[PDB]
């Protein structure tokens, strides 16, 4: 569930 979200 997204470890490093880019927005």
């Amino acid at each position, epitope marked *: 569930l*997204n*470890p*490093d*979200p*880019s*927005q």
Partner: antibody
Amino acid sequence: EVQLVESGGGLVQPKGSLKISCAASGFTFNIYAMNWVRQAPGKGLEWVARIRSQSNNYTTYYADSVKDRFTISRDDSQSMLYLQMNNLKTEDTAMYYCVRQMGDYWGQGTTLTVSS
Amino acid sequence: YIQMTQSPASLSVSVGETVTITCRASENIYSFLAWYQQKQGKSPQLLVYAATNLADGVPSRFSGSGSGTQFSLKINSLQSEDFGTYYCQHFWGTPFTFGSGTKLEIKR
């Protein structure tokens, strides 16, 4: 389970330096964004700094009161998160938290005390 | 920078009573918001992520709702264990600022 253990905290003379640490295990460290959060005694939670994963070029974010003075880093080889704190001020006295991603897991904290 | 203003500062609450802590964002933060429960002497624990999603190992009585600017956590039939300080955080652009806190006490 997922665990983050903080260490390194202690008494530091104002205008001094300390490098607090965070050891991670039970999850794939190198794919996660990581951050530090602080809490002054009796006060609320203040976000300090963040660092993105290797795949996103390790891009870093800081708080205005901490910028140029604190540098967040990570050793992916050892699953370690660090906070170098230079030129410490009194208002930097706090419990420092190592937090994963957007806040699903927090460590137990080390205390920092800035006092002469 | 986006300011989050939390209300109320403190709550005195009887067991089985239901309560709602609200959190308003200065600007539109969409759904990038989390709720935390901290107990004195301990580290915070994630209660709701993305404004409306209940986190693992959190009782069903905890309800997250809201989008845009006005968010609110709701507790149904507050249990003795639900004592603590409740914080909200947004994550729409650095710095990810926190609420000022809601101190929750058990009525006795």
